C-alpha cells in the first residue's frame, strides 16, 4: 500500500538488501503515464544508500527492500511515502503519484 513495484529485467533473484545495510541501485524519473523524466544512468552513476535509514523515502526504502542484485523494475510509490508532496515545477507533480524504475546493481 502506498507502494507497488512491477518487475521488468529479472536478475539474481537470491542477493537482497539487509535491513540497515547499504545497497546501490539505479533510479530512473517515469510518470505514471510513461513518461521519462531525470535519471541517475544518465549520468553513469548508481545511487547508494542505507536501506531501512532516513537518508531516502519510504518508497525507496520498500521498493529497494523487496529488490534483489542485479534486478530491475519499476518503482510506484505515492507522494505521501515520497518527495511527491511537495515536487517542483518540470520536474515532480503537487502531490502525485510517482514511478521511479530502480534497478539493483549491488549491495554492501
Not at 68 to 85: E, F, I, N
Not at 89 to 108: S, Y
Request: glycine residues 12%; hydrophobic residues 35%; aromatic residues 8%.
Amino acid at each position: 500500500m502506498g507502494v507497488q513495484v512491477v518487475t521488468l529485467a529479472a536478475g539474481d533473484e537470491a542477493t537482497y538488501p539487509k535491513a540497515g545495510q547499504v545497497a546501490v541501485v539505479h533510479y530512473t524519473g517515469t510518470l505514471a503515464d510513461g513518461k521519462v523524466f531525470d535519471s541517475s544512468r544518465t549520468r553513469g552513476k548508481p545511487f547508494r544508500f542505507t536501506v531501512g535509514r532516513g537518508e531516502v523515502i519510504r518508497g525507496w526504502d520498500e521498493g529497494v527492500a523487496q529488490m534483489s542484485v542485479g534486478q530491475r523494475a519499476k518503482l510506484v510509490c505515492s507522494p505521501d511515502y515520497a518527495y511527491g508532496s511537495r515536487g517542483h515545477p518540470g520536474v515532480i507533480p503537487p502531490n502525485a503519484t510517482l514511478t521511479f524504475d530502480v534497478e539493483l546493481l549491488r549491495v554492501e
